[PDB]
Amino acid sequence: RFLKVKNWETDVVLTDTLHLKSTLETGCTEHICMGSIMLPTKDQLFPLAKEFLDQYYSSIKRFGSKAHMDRLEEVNKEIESTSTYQLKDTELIYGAKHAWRNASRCVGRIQWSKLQVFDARDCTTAHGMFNYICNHVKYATNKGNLRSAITIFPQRTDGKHDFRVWNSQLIRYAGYKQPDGSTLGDPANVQFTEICIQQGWKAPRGRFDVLPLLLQANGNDPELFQIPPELVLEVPIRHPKFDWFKDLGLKWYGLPAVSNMLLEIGGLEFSACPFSGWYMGTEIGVRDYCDNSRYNILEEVAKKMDLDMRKTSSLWKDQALVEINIAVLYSFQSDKVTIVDHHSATESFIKHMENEYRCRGGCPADWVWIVPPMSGSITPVFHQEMLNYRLTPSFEYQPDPWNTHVW
Amino acid sequence: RFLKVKNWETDVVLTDTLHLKSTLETGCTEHICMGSIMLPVRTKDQLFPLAKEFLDQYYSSIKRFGSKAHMDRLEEVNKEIESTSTYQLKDTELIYGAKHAWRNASRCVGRIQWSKLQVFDARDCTTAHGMFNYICNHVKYATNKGNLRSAITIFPQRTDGKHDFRVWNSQLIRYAGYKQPDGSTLGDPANVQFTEICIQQGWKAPRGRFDVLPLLLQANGNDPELFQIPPELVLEVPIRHPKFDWFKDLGLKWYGLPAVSNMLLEIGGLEFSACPFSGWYMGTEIGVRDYCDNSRYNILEEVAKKMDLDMRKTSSLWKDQALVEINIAVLYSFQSDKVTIVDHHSATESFIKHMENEYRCRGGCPADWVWIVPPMSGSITPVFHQEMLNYRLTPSFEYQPDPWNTHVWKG
Ligand code: HEM
Ligand code: HEM
Ligand SMILES: C=NCc1cncc(OCc2ccc3ccc(N)nc3c2)c1
Ligand SMILES: C=NCc1cncc(OCc2ccc3ccc(N)nc3c2)c1
Ligand SMILES: C[C@H](O)[C@H](O)[C@H]1CNc2nc(N)[nH]c(=O)c2N1
Ligand SMILES: C[C@H](O)[C@H](O)[C@H]1CNc2nc(N)[nH]c(=O)c2N1
Ligand SMILES: [Zn+2]
């Protein structure tokens, strides 16, 4: 019930008490670990509201205060009447920052308290949403000096009036299926690029076409909007040693801005809550470029380096992978766009873990996601035992809108 | 209950019914996942259900479930337990048990080979000298002049836990570690504690960087004894790089035979506390972990210097770059000397096929993702994208405490 975690490279042992506050379920049982599975009303409402409000007022040294009790009273009265309730601005900000703080799969949580929260709860239309989103993008991008931000659209009411951003990220390249049988652009987005076309989009059918936004307000049909090109900061990808690298014609966008998740605070459900930080190099270099069901460029890069691709034991894929990742970092840095390498970020996370254990009693962490997709054991997180559990407020997964939307 | 797993690179979805035959606990609960935690005397009372369950499995596998041979064997074991508080396995049972323990080892990427395992029955052994002889033969047989063969040597089962056979080495072949008065470590830092024990027990240490450790063997619960593996039996490989000629000057070598000796084999409730087993190396065990862990030989810097990588900023990925070259050199060296080894791409690829085969033929394959995924280049191997269900089946290999922490000294 009081758990210890060991770092095996350093023998440091932390004691986790925070997990006893965990509420939601992991998917695992005593008979089975699902640690590597991708996705494992008024009486419902008030305890949830109460538990959140309890942690809020404790966090501001006002637990058991008149202001505390008043707010509990007040929210309880609002729930009784409206069947929902509204967060005070302060609570909204705490809630958001804490959803990040609790995101067990996030290696960048050391930055969690420095999140810019944009209250977009007065929004009523997709045009409105578009405006809020352009502002988020410009603010977050900041001419390459990235700043973390989240924009929070109105909370779910009766599930018929949901706000949803249909894109999985605010910025992402298109994916088209060729008669050739292959795939042009980003294969991860083939279906979404289709639904854009189905709903009107004029695709330039290229390899790196920034997708249009597909915005859904109040449960209405979603609408297309093109982000101002001048707001989409992109980095051309070159290598600091191989001049042929530029000829591969690769680029990536500076702003990772996840738009498809669900923010839960005090039982309230924010279906449209796009948030953004900045890239860890491997997200692009390892996953986006080298995953087989993505840009899958490994073969071509290797061939250009003239490595022995005959036997896998030449570790040519490994060599190419390293070089590709060197280039991603080199390009971003040269263009003064914020980026962190997998060594710095994992080392930062270890310090953060130690802070959370020391100041909060622990830190929920999903090893399967925290360890970078390359060079795993030469990063400190590899040797770090982690406890995974679900705290609230949280970011949750939610079904893709097209499978849901009552057209 | 049926459980599905998905490969997110291929969209293959498999169905697990095998987890239903799971008993032992995972460490996990509905409120906490302990999936990345490294480590999360038995009465006649608890012994017969364990025996029966095993014997039920064994006889299914040979398509004799419910036959008279099956029933009589259950009878015989039943009686033998109430009479002797334990029982003995038939040779067939031991062999089946050993293979299935490997097959059930959820952290082993090498399980495609599970059915081909040479079982050495050392249950007639009584003394440490007898142990040394058995081990020597294991080493010679498994080595096979570089053409490695999986083998396991099974010494006598636990009785009262007061007469245990134990191999005090974590591996049959492993390099000495020496702490120096200045804080630095000479040799393998992983073995400083065991090295010290050996030294105290009479071992004359050469005090070099790659001294092969002596066998420290415990028979029947008596104090352990030192034995030197004949050098001619210890196959080693000098490490060089195919393009880099300075690499040989790094003075590196490794032993060819990975032979794990500190685990406990459990079969039908019976506990085998000394069951050394051996296969062959996946290149990353040496090249990534043994050479490059900060707490091991830790050669990344020295290799990086020699490569003249930009080492001032970690965003140069000089570490990643040096790691790859070392792993290249490890594979090249072994292949050049015709010592069996497998790269992490081949091994993970084989594991996916094995695992699929296991779902089809067996209804599942327990697998520990945290361990299965290679410690370099994780996502460019197919296992990274594979969902896995982890659970514990018997027969199994279990951890046990280091014998020096539990041994009662005779003098
Ligand atoms: C500022 C620098 C940040 C860095 C370097 C970073 C890093 C990462 C990385 C590498 C992942 C793995 C994701 C993948 O492989 O697809 C991840 C996941 C995640 N991040 Fe962070 N992140 C940052 C900011 C943020 C912010 C601002 C938020 C929310 C306010 C956030 C919330 C999350 C969540 C919820 C996940 C897991 C999502 C899932 O379960 O699929 N991160 N992060
Ligand atoms: C024949 C070629 C084999 C290969 C390539 C192989 C590969 C591996 C690797 C790379 C590991 C992870 C090691 C680590 O990181 O510490 C492992 C773990 C393991 N292997 Fe295999 N193995 C082989 C044969 C065997 C055999 C013959 C047995 C037993 C009869 C076995 C049983 C196990 C067990 C029980 C573990 C888990 C160790 C633990 O929990 O600490 N393997 N294997
Ligand atoms: C697509 N992979 C699974 C998945 C599903 N749904 C959302 C996901 O987002 C990952 C994610 C989330 C937030 C991030 C913030 C910053 C950053 N650099 N990467 C980040 C990556 C990932
Ligand atoms: C010390 N490291 C953890 C550890 C503890 N106790 C036993 C271990 O065994 C690892 C292991 C076990 C069996 C193997 C068989 C073949 C192989 N190539 N590596 C293998 C590696 C590992
Ligand atoms: C099957 C496995 O759970 C899946 O591939 C996970 C593994 N770890 C990951 N880790 C990160 N950071 N991102 C991912 O998308 C994944 N995918
Ligand atoms: C904390 C963590 O469980 C520990 O470092 C694990 C990670 N995965 C591993 N995987 C393998 N194959 N071998 C190991 O020793 C480890 N160590
Ligand atoms: Zn688990």
Side-chain angles (χ1 to χ4, degrees), chain B residues 211-248:
Chain B
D211 309 334
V212 175
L213 283 161
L215 287 173
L216 195 36
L217 310 168
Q218 167 189 318
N220 211 247
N222 302 303
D223 294 338
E225 311 180 16
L226 286 176
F227 303 96
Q228 181 181 109
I229 314 180
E232 62 263 42
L233 256 39
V234 184
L235 175 55
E236 303 190 88
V237 180
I239 309 301
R240 62 280 189 184
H241 188 282
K243 324 249 274 287
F244 294 158
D245 189 63
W246 48 260
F247 203 94
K248 67 182 185 303

Short mmCIF file of all heavy atoms in Angstrom, two decimals, chain B residues 211-248:
data_model
loop_
_atom_site.label_atom_id
_atom_site.label_comp_id
_atom_site.label_asym_id
_atom_site.label_seq_id
_atom_site.Cartn_x
_atom_site.Cartn_y
_atom_site.Cartn_z
N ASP B 211 38.81 -11.07 -16.36
CA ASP B 211 39.07 -12.34 -15.70
C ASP B 211 37.79 -13.15 -15.59
O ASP B 211 36.80 -12.68 -15.03
CB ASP B 211 39.66 -12.10 -14.30
CG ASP B 211 40.84 -11.15 -14.30
OD1 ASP B 211 41.53 -11.03 -15.34
OD2 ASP B 211 41.09 -10.51 -13.25
N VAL B 212 37.79 -14.37 -16.12
CA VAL B 212 36.64 -15.27 -15.98
C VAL B 212 36.54 -15.72 -14.52
O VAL B 212 37.53 -16.18 -13.94
CB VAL B 212 36.71 -16.48 -16.95
CG1 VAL B 212 35.58 -17.46 -16.69
CG2 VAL B 212 36.68 -16.01 -18.39
N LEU B 213 35.37 -15.57 -13.92
CA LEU B 213 35.18 -15.88 -12.50
C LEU B 213 35.15 -17.38 -12.25
O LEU B 213 34.79 -18.16 -13.13
CB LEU B 213 33.89 -15.25 -11.98
CG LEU B 213 33.97 -13.74 -11.71
CD1 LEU B 213 32.58 -13.17 -11.68
CD2 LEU B 213 34.72 -13.44 -10.41
N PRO B 214 35.53 -17.80 -11.03
CA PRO B 214 35.46 -19.23 -10.70
C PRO B 214 34.04 -19.65 -10.39
O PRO B 214 33.23 -18.81 -9.97
CB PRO B 214 36.32 -19.33 -9.44
CG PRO B 214 36.19 -18.00 -8.77
CD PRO B 214 36.08 -16.99 -9.92
N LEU B 215 33.72 -20.92 -10.59
CA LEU B 215 32.41 -21.42 -10.18
C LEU B 215 32.38 -21.51 -8.67
O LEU B 215 33.34 -21.98 -8.05
CB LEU B 215 32.13 -22.78 -10.81
CG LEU B 215 31.82 -22.74 -12.30
CD1 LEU B 215 31.71 -24.13 -12.87
CD2 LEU B 215 30.53 -22.00 -12.54
N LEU B 216 31.28 -21.05 -8.07
CA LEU B 216 31.08 -21.17 -6.63
C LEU B 216 29.85 -22.03 -6.43
O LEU B 216 28.73 -21.54 -6.61
CB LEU B 216 30.88 -19.80 -5.99
CG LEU B 216 31.01 -19.69 -4.46
CD1 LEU B 216 32.10 -20.65 -3.91
CD2 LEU B 216 31.29 -18.25 -4.03
N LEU B 217 30.06 -23.29 -6.05
CA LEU B 217 28.99 -24.29 -6.09
C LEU B 217 28.58 -24.87 -4.73
O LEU B 217 29.42 -25.32 -3.94
CB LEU B 217 29.37 -25.41 -7.05
CG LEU B 217 29.83 -24.94 -8.43
CD1 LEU B 217 30.46 -26.09 -9.23
CD2 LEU B 217 28.67 -24.33 -9.21
N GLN B 218 27.27 -24.87 -4.49
CA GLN B 218 26.68 -25.35 -3.25
C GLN B 218 25.85 -26.60 -3.49
O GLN B 218 24.87 -26.59 -4.25
CB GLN B 218 25.83 -24.25 -2.60
CG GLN B 218 24.91 -24.72 -1.47
CD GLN B 218 23.93 -23.64 -1.01
OE1 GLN B 218 24.28 -22.46 -0.87
NE2 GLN B 218 22.69 -24.05 -0.77
N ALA B 219 26.24 -27.70 -2.86
CA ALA B 219 25.49 -28.95 -2.98
C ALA B 219 24.89 -29.32 -1.64
O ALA B 219 25.56 -29.27 -0.61
CB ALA B 219 26.40 -30.07 -3.48
N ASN B 220 23.61 -29.69 -1.67
CA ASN B 220 22.94 -30.26 -0.51
C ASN B 220 22.89 -29.37 0.72
O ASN B 220 22.70 -29.84 1.84
CB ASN B 220 23.56 -31.62 -0.16
CG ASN B 220 22.56 -32.57 0.44
OD1 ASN B 220 22.65 -32.93 1.61
ND2 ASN B 220 21.59 -32.98 -0.36
N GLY B 221 23.04 -28.07 0.51
CA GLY B 221 22.98 -27.11 1.60
C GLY B 221 24.31 -26.88 2.29
O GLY B 221 24.39 -26.07 3.22
N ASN B 222 25.35 -27.59 1.86
CA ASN B 222 26.69 -27.37 2.40
C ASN B 222 27.31 -26.08 1.88
O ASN B 222 26.86 -25.54 0.88
CB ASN B 222 27.59 -28.55 2.08
CG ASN B 222 27.04 -29.84 2.62
OD1 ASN B 222 26.79 -29.97 3.82
ND2 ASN B 222 26.79 -30.80 1.73
N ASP B 223 28.35 -25.60 2.56
CA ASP B 223 29.03 -24.37 2.15
C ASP B 223 29.55 -24.52 0.72
O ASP B 223 29.93 -25.62 0.31
CB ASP B 223 30.17 -24.04 3.11
CG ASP B 223 29.68 -23.69 4.51
OD1 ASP B 223 28.50 -23.29 4.67
OD2 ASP B 223 30.49 -23.78 5.45
N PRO B 224 29.54 -23.42 -0.04
CA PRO B 224 29.93 -23.54 -1.45
C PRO B 224 31.44 -23.74 -1.61
O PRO B 224 32.22 -23.39 -0.73
CB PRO B 224 29.47 -22.20 -2.06
CG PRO B 224 29.51 -21.26 -0.93
CD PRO B 224 29.13 -22.05 0.30
N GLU B 225 31.84 -24.31 -2.75
CA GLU B 225 33.25 -24.55 -3.02
C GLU B 225 33.67 -23.93 -4.36
O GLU B 225 32.88 -23.86 -5.30
CB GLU B 225 33.52 -26.05 -3.05
CG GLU B 225 32.98 -26.80 -1.85
CD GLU B 225 33.28 -28.30 -1.91
OE1 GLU B 225 34.15 -28.70 -2.71
OE2 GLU B 225 32.63 -29.06 -1.16
N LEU B 226 34.92 -23.49 -4.44
CA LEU B 226 35.44 -22.86 -5.65
C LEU B 226 35.97 -23.89 -6.66
O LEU B 226 36.63 -24.86 -6.30
CB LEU B 226 36.53 -21.84 -5.30
CG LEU B 226 36.05 -20.53 -4.68
CD1 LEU B 226 37.22 -19.66 -4.29
CD2 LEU B 226 35.13 -19.78 -5.64
N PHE B 227 35.66 -23.66 -7.93
CA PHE B 227 36.19 -24.48 -9.01
C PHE B 227 36.50 -23.61 -10.22
O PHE B 227 35.73 -22.72 -10.57
CB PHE B 227 35.20 -25.56 -9.42
CG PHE B 227 34.78 -26.46 -8.31
CD1 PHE B 227 33.61 -26.22 -7.61
CD2 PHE B 227 35.53 -27.59 -7.99
CE1 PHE B 227 33.20 -27.07 -6.59
CE2 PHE B 227 35.13 -28.44 -6.97
CZ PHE B 227 33.97 -28.18 -6.27
N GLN B 228 37.62 -23.89 -10.87
CA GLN B 228 37.98 -23.13 -12.05
C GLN B 228 37.52 -23.89 -13.28
O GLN B 228 37.88 -25.06 -13.47
CB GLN B 228 39.48 -22.91 -12.08
CG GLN B 228 39.96 -22.11 -13.26
CD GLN B 228 41.46 -21.96 -13.26
OE1 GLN B 228 42.16 -22.55 -14.09
NE2 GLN B 228 41.97 -21.18 -12.31
N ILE B 229 36.69 -23.24 -14.08
CA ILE B 229 36.30 -23.78 -15.38
C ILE B 229 37.57 -23.87 -16.22
O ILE B 229 38.32 -22.91 -16.30
CB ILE B 229 35.32 -22.85 -16.13
CG1 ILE B 229 34.20 -22.35 -15.21
CG2 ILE B 229 34.74 -23.54 -17.34
CD1 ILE B 229 33.19 -21.42 -15.89
N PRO B 230 37.82 -25.04 -16.83
CA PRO B 230 39.03 -25.13 -17.65
C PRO B 230 38.97 -24.11 -18.78
O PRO B 230 37.98 -24.06 -19.52
CB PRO B 230 38.97 -26.57 -18.20
CG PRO B 230 38.07 -27.31 -17.25
CD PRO B 230 37.05 -26.29 -16.83
N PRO B 231 40.01 -23.27 -18.90
CA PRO B 231 40.04 -22.17 -19.87
C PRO B 231 39.68 -22.63 -21.27
O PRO B 231 38.97 -21.93 -21.99
CB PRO B 231 41.49 -21.72 -19.82
CG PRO B 231 41.89 -21.97 -18.40
CD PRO B 231 41.20 -23.26 -18.03
N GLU B 232 40.12 -23.84 -21.63
CA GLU B 232 39.88 -24.39 -22.96
C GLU B 232 38.38 -24.57 -23.22
O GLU B 232 37.94 -24.71 -24.36
CB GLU B 232 40.66 -25.71 -23.19
CG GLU B 232 40.28 -26.86 -22.25
CD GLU B 232 41.21 -27.01 -21.05
OE1 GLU B 232 41.57 -25.98 -20.45
OE2 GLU B 232 41.57 -28.17 -20.68
N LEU B 233 37.60 -24.55 -22.15
CA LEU B 233 36.17 -24.70 -22.28
C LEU B 233 35.49 -23.34 -22.41
O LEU B 233 34.34 -23.26 -22.82
CB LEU B 233 35.61 -25.50 -21.10
CG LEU B 233 35.23 -26.96 -21.34
CD1 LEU B 233 36.23 -27.65 -22.27
CD2 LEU B 233 35.09 -27.70 -20.01
N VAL B 234 36.19 -22.27 -22.06
CA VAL B 234 35.61 -20.93 -22.12
C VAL B 234 35.86 -20.25 -23.46
O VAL B 234 36.96 -19.75 -23.71
CB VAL B 234 36.16 -20.04 -21.01
CG1 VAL B 234 35.46 -18.67 -21.02
CG2 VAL B 234 35.99 -20.73 -19.67
N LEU B 235 34.86 -20.26 -24.33
CA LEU B 235 34.99 -19.66 -25.65
C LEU B 235 34.72 -18.17 -25.53
O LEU B 235 33.69 -17.76 -25.00
CB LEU B 235 34.01 -20.29 -26.65
CG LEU B 235 34.00 -19.65 -28.04
CD1 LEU B 235 35.41 -19.63 -28.66
CD2 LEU B 235 33.01 -20.34 -28.97
N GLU B 236 35.68 -17.37 -26.01
CA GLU B 236 35.63 -15.92 -25.96
C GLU B 236 35.84 -15.33 -27.36
O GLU B 236 36.44 -15.98 -28.23
CB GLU B 236 36.72 -15.37 -25.03
CG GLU B 236 36.68 -15.89 -23.61
CD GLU B 236 37.63 -15.12 -22.70
OE1 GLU B 236 37.23 -14.09 -22.15
OE2 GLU B 236 38.79 -15.54 -22.53
N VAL B 237 35.37 -14.10 -27.56
CA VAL B 237 35.49 -13.41 -28.86
C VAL B 237 36.10 -12.02 -28.73
O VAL B 237 35.52 -11.15 -28.07
CB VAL B 237 34.10 -13.19 -29.52
CG1 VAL B 237 34.26 -12.47 -30.86
CG2 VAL B 237 33.32 -14.48 -29.69
N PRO B 238 37.25 -11.78 -29.39
CA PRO B 238 37.87 -10.45 -29.40
C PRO B 238 36.99 -9.46 -30.17
O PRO B 238 36.53 -9.77 -31.27
CB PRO B 238 39.17 -10.66 -30.19
CG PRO B 238 39.27 -12.12 -30.44
CD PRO B 238 37.88 -12.67 -30.37
N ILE B 239 36.76 -8.27 -29.63
CA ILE B 239 35.85 -7.35 -30.31
C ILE B 239 36.58 -6.36 -31.22
O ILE B 239 37.40 -5.54 -30.77
CB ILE B 239 34.91 -6.61 -29.32
CG1 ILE B 239 34.22 -7.62 -28.40
CG2 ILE B 239 33.87 -5.79 -30.10
CD1 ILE B 239 33.40 -8.68 -29.12
N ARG B 240 36.26 -6.44 -32.51
CA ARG B 240 36.75 -5.48 -33.49
C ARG B 240 35.59 -4.96 -34.36
O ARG B 240 34.49 -5.52 -34.37
CB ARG B 240 37.90 -6.06 -34.34
CG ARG B 240 37.54 -7.29 -35.19
CD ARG B 240 37.52 -8.60 -34.40
NE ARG B 240 37.38 -9.76 -35.27
CZ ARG B 240 37.27 -11.02 -34.86
NH1 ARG B 240 37.26 -11.30 -33.55
NH2 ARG B 240 37.15 -12.00 -35.74
N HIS B 241 35.85 -3.87 -35.07
CA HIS B 241 34.83 -3.22 -35.89
C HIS B 241 35.28 -3.39 -37.33
O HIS B 241 36.47 -3.30 -37.62
CB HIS B 241 34.74 -1.75 -35.51
CG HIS B 241 33.60 -1.01 -36.15
ND1 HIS B 241 33.63 -0.57 -37.45
CD2 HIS B 241 32.41 -0.60 -35.64
CE1 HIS B 241 32.50 0.06 -37.73
NE2 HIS B 241 31.75 0.05 -36.65
N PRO B 242 34.33 -3.66 -38.24
CA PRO B 242 34.67 -3.96 -39.64
C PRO B 242 35.36 -2.81 -40.39
O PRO B 242 36.18 -3.08 -41.27
CB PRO B 242 33.31 -4.28 -40.28
CG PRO B 242 32.29 -3.63 -39.36
CD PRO B 242 32.88 -3.74 -37.98
N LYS B 243 35.06 -1.56 -40.05
CA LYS B 243 35.65 -0.42 -40.75
C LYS B 243 36.66 0.32 -39.87
O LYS B 243 37.57 0.97 -40.37
CB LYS B 243 34.56 0.54 -41.21
CG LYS B 243 33.28 -0.16 -41.67
CD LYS B 243 33.06 -0.02 -43.16
CE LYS B 243 32.32 1.27 -43.51
NZ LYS B 243 30.88 1.20 -43.14
N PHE B 244 36.49 0.23 -38.55
CA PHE B 244 37.31 0.98 -37.60
C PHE B 244 38.44 0.12 -37.03
O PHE B 244 38.21 -0.77 -36.22
CB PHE B 244 36.45 1.50 -36.44
CG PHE B 244 35.43 2.52 -36.84
CD1 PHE B 244 34.31 2.74 -36.05
CD2 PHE B 244 35.58 3.26 -38.00
CE1 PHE B 244 33.36 3.69 -36.40
CE2 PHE B 244 34.63 4.22 -38.36
CZ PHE B 244 33.52 4.42 -37.56
N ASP B 245 39.67 0.41 -37.44
CA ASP B 245 40.81 -0.39 -37.03
C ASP B 245 41.30 -0.09 -35.62
O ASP B 245 42.00 -0.89 -35.01
CB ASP B 245 41.95 -0.23 -38.04
CG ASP B 245 43.07 -1.21 -37.79
OD1 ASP B 245 42.81 -2.43 -37.90
OD2 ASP B 245 44.19 -0.76 -37.47
N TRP B 246 40.91 1.05 -35.07
CA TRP B 246 41.32 1.38 -33.70
C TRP B 246 40.47 0.63 -32.67
O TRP B 246 40.83 0.55 -31.50
CB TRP B 246 41.22 2.88 -33.46
CG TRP B 246 39.93 3.49 -33.90
CD1 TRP B 246 39.71 4.18 -35.06
CD2 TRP B 246 38.69 3.48 -33.20
NE1 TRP B 246 38.40 4.59 -35.12
CE2 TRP B 246 37.76 4.18 -33.98
CE3 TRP B 246 38.28 2.95 -31.97
CZ2 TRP B 246 36.43 4.36 -33.59
CZ3 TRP B 246 36.96 3.12 -31.58
CH2 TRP B 246 36.05 3.83 -32.39
N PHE B 247 39.35 0.09 -33.13
CA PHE B 247 38.40 -0.55 -32.24
C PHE B 247 39.00 -1.74 -31.49
O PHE B 247 38.70 -1.94 -30.31
CB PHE B 247 37.14 -0.99 -32.99
CG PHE B 247 35.93 -1.15 -32.10
CD1 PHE B 247 35.02 -0.09 -31.93
CD2 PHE B 247 35.71 -2.34 -31.41
CE1 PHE B 247 33.91 -0.23 -31.11
CE2 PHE B 247 34.60 -2.48 -30.58
CZ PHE B 247 33.69 -1.42 -30.43
N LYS B 248 39.87 -2.50 -32.16
CA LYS B 248 40.50 -3.66 -31.52
C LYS B 248 41.37 -3.21 -30.36
O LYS B 248 41.45 -3.88 -29.33
CB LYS B 248 41.33 -4.46 -32.54
CG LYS B 248 42.56 -3.74 -33.07
CD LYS B 248 43.29 -4.58 -34.10
CE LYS B 248 44.58 -3.93 -34.55
NZ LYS B 248 44.29 -2.58 -35.11
#
